[PDB]
């Protein structure tokens, strides 16, 4: 069974979401409007920026990270929001229209959509995939909350100073999360090793993503679009 | 310079 | 009477404000809508960053200044651009209202509004005052446009290089506004001097902006609200 | 840098 730790540590981590992901979908409507050249842009660009406020308002209550050096703490960030963000946003996903459903059908986003702000299918159906693949493993909100939260604290990512302490941290998490799923996820006996899939696959999307960005944000006319927050994010200048 | 992390990590 | 030089200028400067002024104001929806801390600042600052884009379309259209160079234009939008936002922002006043209305009263903004994007009233006090006073010349037209020409080429700008060029085309704006005023505008015997004290006035309105934008951008929570072209055209970084 | 307005400047 789990310890008071690893208990502890699910406990504030569920907390933590339930804090930072808005299941009302009510602030979308400050975002700037949908559109449907990159009519999209805008207003995905609002949907991202917002959400990369959600994800560090997460990663701000994960255990051990606010401890981290700012230096660690950014680099994590620049390194893993493109990648919790992919993740979070299975939350709205459904498998029946294949698509986010935030809301009313004005905040409900195909592939199509995000096409109007830059994308290609090299990137949108490899994402979508991920999707349909990640909703398919029926999570429990534990073990969703546990995977963002390793997915934070890799310390493989670049211009991380301190491997050891985020490599502690990370593992710490791990153990939570194959403990837990031993004892609490009945049929789980293969879940761990899907999940650790998943992480890789978020890389693979993480690289995919950075091209197209890097394509879009060199063009002045549709970086401008951007909001300051994404533009340092996603940024290079680090 | 990251100005809006900063600020956002408090 | 006037030579079709002068003649030519002033229709090439009406086409040009006709071109960048949309008085449907129907892009208005694409905004960040607004809110009434500083609940106003994500829609003014998409109007600004939207106003910007067309003071520049305008000033590409000014007969001399696209044969300036890349600096010069640069210099003379980034000093300029806040004041002929000002005055062309009279277009969209009401003496009725003492307040700007733009469509719907969505789109209506007093001076309460821009205390909700975190200006005070030592400037939005001068500013409407600025508007109410410049409503009650009643220009015409081709007054308005010259004006902003004129605006915009004041040569005593930080920054600007070819000080004589750029003198040499403001000047001869002036002759073509002055001489219209003379043979076109009826007991406007006066008119041309008031025009030159709005463009003072314009000079300390810009004053006290700046210190309030400093004060506003140096807070990256309010900072983050604003639009990259916003950022840069009111940026200090030339 | 002003890459923005160099853009928009044409
Ligand atoms: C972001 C979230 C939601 C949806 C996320 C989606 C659906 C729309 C398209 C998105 C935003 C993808 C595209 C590729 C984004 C990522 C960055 C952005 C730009 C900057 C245009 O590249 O494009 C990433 C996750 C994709 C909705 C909801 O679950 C909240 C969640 O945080
Ligand atoms: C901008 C325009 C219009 C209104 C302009 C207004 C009314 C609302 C408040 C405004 C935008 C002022 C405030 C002070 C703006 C200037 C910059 C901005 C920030 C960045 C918040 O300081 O605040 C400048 C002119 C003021 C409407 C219409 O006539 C189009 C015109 O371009």
């Known amino acids: 069974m789990l310890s008071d730790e690893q208990m502890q540590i699910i406990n504030s981590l569920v907390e933590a979401h339930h804090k930072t992901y808005d299941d009302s979908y009510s602030d979308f ?16 660009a609002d949907l991202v920026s917002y959400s990369i406020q959600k994800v560090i308002g997460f990663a701000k209550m994960i255990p051990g990270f606010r401890d981290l050096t700012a230096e660690d703490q950014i680099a994590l960030l620049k390194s893993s929001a493109i990648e919790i963000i992919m993740l979070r946003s299975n939350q709205s ?42 909703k398919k493993l029926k999570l429990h909100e534990e073990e969703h909350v546990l995977l963002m939260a390793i997915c934070l604290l890799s310390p493989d990512r670049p211009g991380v100073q301190d491997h050891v302490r985020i490599e502690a941290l990370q593992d710490r998490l791990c153990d939570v999360l194959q403990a837990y799923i031993r004892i609490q996820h009945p049929g789980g006996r293969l879940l761990y090793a899907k999940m650790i ?20 944000s060199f063009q002045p006319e549709h970086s401008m679009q951007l909001t300051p927050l994404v533009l340092e994010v996603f940024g290079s200048e680090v | 310079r990251h100005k809006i992390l900063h600020r956002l990590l408090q």
Chains 1, 3 share one sequence.
Request: overall charge positive; hydrophobic content about 35%; some cysteine.
């Open chain 1, 197 to 216: 899939q998943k992480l890789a696959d978020l890389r693979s999307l993480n690289e995919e993503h950075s091209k197209q960005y890097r394509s879009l």
């Open chain 1, 29 to 44: 409507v400050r975002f700037r409007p949908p559109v449907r050249r990159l009519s999209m842009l805008p207003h995905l």
């Open chain 1, 93 to 134: 996903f459904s498998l029946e229209d294949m698509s986010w459903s935030c809301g009313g059908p004005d905040f409900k986003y195909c592939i199509n959509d995000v096409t109007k702000a830059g994308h290609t299918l090299e990137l949108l159906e490899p994402l979508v995939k991920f999707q349909v693949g990640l």
